[PDB]
Amino acid sequence: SKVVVPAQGKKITLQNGKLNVPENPIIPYIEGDGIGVDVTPAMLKVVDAAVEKAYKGERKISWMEIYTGEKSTQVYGQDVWLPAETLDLIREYRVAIKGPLTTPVGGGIRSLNVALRQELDLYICLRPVRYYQGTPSPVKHPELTDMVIFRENSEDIYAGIEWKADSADAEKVIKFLREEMGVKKIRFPEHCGIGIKPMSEEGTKRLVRAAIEYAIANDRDSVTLVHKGNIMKFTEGAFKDWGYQLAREEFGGELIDGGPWLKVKNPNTGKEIVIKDVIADAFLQQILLRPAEYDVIACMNLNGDYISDALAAQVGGIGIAPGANIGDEYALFEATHGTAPDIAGQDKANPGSIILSAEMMLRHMGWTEAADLIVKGMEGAINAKTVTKDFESLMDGAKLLKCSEFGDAIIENM
Amino acid sequence: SKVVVPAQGKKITLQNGKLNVPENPIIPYIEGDGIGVDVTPAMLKVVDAAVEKAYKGERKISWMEIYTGEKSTQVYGQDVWLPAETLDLIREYRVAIKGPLTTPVGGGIRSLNVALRQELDLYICLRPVRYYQGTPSPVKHPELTDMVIFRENSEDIYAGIEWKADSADAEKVIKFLREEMGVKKIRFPEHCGIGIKPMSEEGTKRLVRAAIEYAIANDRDSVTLVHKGNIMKFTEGAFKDWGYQLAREEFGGELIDGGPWLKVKNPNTGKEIVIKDVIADAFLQQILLRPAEYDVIACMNLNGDYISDALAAQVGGIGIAPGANIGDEYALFEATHGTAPDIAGQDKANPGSIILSAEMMLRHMGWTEAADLIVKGMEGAINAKTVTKDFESLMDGAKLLKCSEFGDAIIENM
Numbered sequence: 075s076k077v078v079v080p081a082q083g084k085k086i087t088l089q090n091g092k093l094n095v096p097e098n099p100i101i102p103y104i105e106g107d108g109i110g111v112d113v114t115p116a117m118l119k120v121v122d123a124a125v126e127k128a129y130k131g132e133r134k135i136s137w138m139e140i141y142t143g144e145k146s147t148q149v150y151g152q153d154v155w156l157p158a159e160t161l162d163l164i165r166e167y168r169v170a171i172k173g174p175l176t177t178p179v180g181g182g183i184r185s186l187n188v189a190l191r192q193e194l195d196l197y198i199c200l201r202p203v204r205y206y207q208g209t210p211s212p213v214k215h216p217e218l219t220d221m222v223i224f225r226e227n228s229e230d231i232y233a234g235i236e237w238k239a240d241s242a243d244a245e246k247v248i249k250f251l252r253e254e255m256g257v258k259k260i261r262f263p264e265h266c267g268i269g270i271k272p273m274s275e276e277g278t279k280r281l282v283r284a285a286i287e288y289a290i291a292n293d294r295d296s297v298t299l300v301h302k303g304n305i306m307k308f309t310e311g312a313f314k315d316w317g318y319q320l321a322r323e324e325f326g327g328e329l330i331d332g333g334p335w336l337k338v339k340n341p342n343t344g345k346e347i348v349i350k351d352v353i354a355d356a357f358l359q360q361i362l363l364r365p366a367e368y369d370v371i372a373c374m375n376l377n378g379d380y381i382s383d384a385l386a387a388q389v390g391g392i393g394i395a396p397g398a399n400i401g402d403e404y405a406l407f408e409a410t411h412g413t414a415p416d417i418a419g420q421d422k423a424n425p426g427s428i429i430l431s432a433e434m435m436l437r438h439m440g441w442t443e444a445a446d447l448i449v450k451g452m453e454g455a456i457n458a459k460t461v462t463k464d465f466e467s468l469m470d471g472a473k474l475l476k477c478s479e480f481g482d483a484i485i486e487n488m
Numbered sequence: 489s490k491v492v493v494p495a496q497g498k499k500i501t502l503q504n505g506k507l508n509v510p511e512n513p514i515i516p517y518i519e520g521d522g523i524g525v526d527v528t529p530a531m532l533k534v535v536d537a538a539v540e541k542a543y544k545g546e547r548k549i550s551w552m553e554i555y556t557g558e559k560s561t562q563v564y565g566q567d568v569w570l571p572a573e574t575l576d577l578i579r580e581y582r583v584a585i586k587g588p589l590t591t592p593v594g595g596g597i598r599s600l601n602v603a604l605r606q607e608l609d610l611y612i613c614l615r616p617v618r619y620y621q622g623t624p625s626p627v628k629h630p631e632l633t634d635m636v637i638f639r640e641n642s643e644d645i646y647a648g649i650e651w652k653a654d655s656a657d658a659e660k661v662i663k664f665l666r667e668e669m670g671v672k673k674i675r676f677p678e679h680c681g682i683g684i685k686p687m688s689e690e691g692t693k694r695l696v697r698a699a700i701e702y703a704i705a706n707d708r709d710s711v712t713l714v715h716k717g718n719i720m721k722f723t724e725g726a727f728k729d730w731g732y733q734l735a736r737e738e739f740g741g742e743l744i745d746g747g748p749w750l751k752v753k754n755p756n757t758g759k760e761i762v763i764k765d766v767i768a769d770a771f772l773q774q775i776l777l778r779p780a781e782y783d784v785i786a787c788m789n790l791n792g793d794y795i796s797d798a799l800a801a802q803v804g805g806i807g808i809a810p811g812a813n814i815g816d817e818y819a820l821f822e823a824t825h826g827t828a829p830d831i832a833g834q835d836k837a838n839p840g841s842i843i844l845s846a847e848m849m850l851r852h853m854g855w856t857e858a859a860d861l862i863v864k865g866m867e868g869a870i871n872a873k874t875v876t877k878d879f880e881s882l883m884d885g886a887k888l889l890k891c892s893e894f895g896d897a898i899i900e901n902m
Binding site for chain 2: 177185188192195197212213214215228229231232233234235236237238239243244246247250251254255257259260261262263264265266267268269270271272273274275276277302304305306307308309312354355356358359362363376379380383384386387388392
């Protein structure tokens with residue numbers, strides 16, 4: 075009802091598991107709450123300049139605004155936070171991008187971000203983290219981090235299965251656990267909240283399959299399965315076991331020395347990709363202490379959330395970290411920072427995150443020249459120290475730029 | 489049967505929730521697997537020199553070796569990894585210390601560390617993290633970190649309640665969840681492992697009560713409740729709500745501005761202690777980016793594991809991080825690093841962790857002068873750059889010391 079389909083423009087289709095992208099594709103975008111009003115226009119302008127320059131006017135995106143969050147309640151009414159129409163429109167047009175979203179508190183509504191991921195079965199949360207020269211960073215050697223996180227995006231405790239302390243449902247679950255399952259390790263069964271952590275073999279193998287195919291297609295050096303399997307043996311530990319099994323079953327993984335690491339030969343470059351694993355708390359230490367030993371990471375949902383955020387902080391990229399939520403049919407690229415309502419509408423926010431998520435979107439569309447121009451633009455603008463306040467306030471000798479002006483600096487550096 | 493109770497020596501008793509420590513207390517110690525054979529003798533020698541110097545021969549610990557891990561199977565037989573006797577001996581003597589422990593794989597045995605915590609109801613895992621001048625660190629300003637982690641140690645997914653994919657028990661639980669509880673969010677119910685995450689009100693309030701009493705007794709500035717409550721509303725979110733409730737109910741917490749932070753007046757110094765909260769993935773960023781804003785941390789079991797490890801890595805203290813597991817009746821202090829079997833028996837390992845855990849033990853015993861001498865000794869030895877290989881290999885101008893020699897350097901610096 076309130077979305078306007080572009081007059082000129084054509085739908086991306088999926089044929090034989092490969093995207094068929096017209097020269098004039100219609101792309102849905104969600105503005106986002108808070109600073110989405112600042113960073114989305116800068117992203118639209120930057121992507122259009124990269125597309126214009128790369129293909130000399132032969133290609134152009136027909137942007138189509140669709141709605142989720144606050145703007146959805148203002149477009150569609152009172153408690154329309156995620157209209158059914160928005161899910162149908164991402165499904166129909168296949169590839170979409172969104173600014174930051176916040177979920178309201180007090181109404182029993184679960185994460186709108188997670189609802190989009192789960193309902194569109196976007197089981198890969200893909201977070202590439204590398205350092206942009208010139209970025210103010212808290213660590214001494216941020217340039218040693220160049221990692222790509224494949225975070226499982228459909229299962230784990232992150233899935234929202236739980237019951238409130240003292241509710242009839244939590245008491246019913248606890249009674250089943252103690253009485254029927256013989257659980258003796260709930261320390262205090264009264265006034266006790268209960269959450270369920272699921273992790274399946276199929277969910278594990280499609281995420282690790284995507285991570286190993288990515289290490290092959292991009293000639294990366296290794297895939298590290300990060301898990302807390304010494305405590306959670308049957309969810310985290312099983313993720314790790316199924317990840318190694320998949321590498322053996324489908325990628326001809328061979329044992330290195332006495333194990334447990336495997337080597338997978340890259341079919342195209344002959345490089346031996348190491349498949350290894352690290353327990354998650356030690357891994358949060360290793361990304362700081364030995365960052366150059368890690369590359370592609372495959373992990374479960376909650377650990378992926380933590381790892382991506384800790385890595386983005388260490389390279390100074392908390393406001394420029396790109397992300398994608400990819401499934402087999404659909405894909406939703408996203409700004410990964412918060413809504414920052416304190417500066418919203420002030421044209422101050424860093425648009426770097428949603429712009430690099432748009433670079434990821436263009437590369438997913440096969441438009442790699444336009445994607446390469448955005449990386450080049452971000453490269454040059456940050457290296458030039460012509461940056462937004464969140465960077466400039468941590469450094470000396472930078473030229474402070476508004477959000478819109480930094481979008482211009484990126485175009486200038488293409 | 490194979491423990492020898494010291495001839496001279498007396499048992500610590502607990503009277504009116506306060507420890508009554510003799511001048512000649514018997515303290516149980518577990519050597520630990522791997523490098524425990526290196527770091528425990530250095531710790532025994534360092535603690536005895538601090539006790540000798542502080543009290544001029546008037547006090548002395550009667551150390552009594554008790555058994556867990558490999559050495560237990562060598563003392564007591566084949567699959568005696570944690571003899572009942574060891575739990576009775578920690579209960580009887582109240583205060584004990586242990587080197588690193590590893591749990592065997594392949595026999596269905598759950599974490600020996602967690603079994604000690606849970607069976608002795610040591611619901612506080614206390615991890616103080618601060619920077620020792622001279623320590624090689626990956627971050628630019630490690631001296632800004634001075635935090636004290638109160639990690640809930642008896643509940644959460646960390647408690648070991650789970651069933652293996654395709655077992656009759658996991659199928660029975662999944663059938664109950666889908667059929668009786670109406671769960672629709674298990675993406676793939678077949679070949680699916682299941683874990684249970686409990687968090688009670690009583691478990692939450694005794695951990696946050698201990699954290700706020702600690703901020704009072706030590707005149708700390710704030711207590712931050714770290715949680716992932718926007719996704720796990722009824723375990724992590726409820727931990728946060730119960731922590732704020734406790735601060736209001738028992739410590740006269742008053743609202744700061746429009747909330748949610750509270751201020752608790754320190755009864756003894758009049759300082760207004762801020763009670764605040766941060767979502768856990770953002771917190772892993774904040775400890776790097778704004779470390780000086782945090783002080784006492786109260787969090788659940790798994791997040792506490794992650795936070796303590798990430799903080800220890802950032803200050804260069806991965807091998808010198810102290811820890812205690814404290815309950816209302818008993819207390820077990822511990823080396824917090826691994827068993828490092830690659831260098832075990834080589835007198836190479838850093839004894840700093842178990843020595844600082846012994847400083848925590850002496851301070852818990854009311855022997856604060858001897859505890860202060862160990863901190864002073866660690867201070868001076870690390871500042872002097874007379875350190876073990878794990879420090880020296882990351883720096884220039886250090887004098888390399890064996891494990892035993894660094895124990896001597898600490899005594900020399902008292």
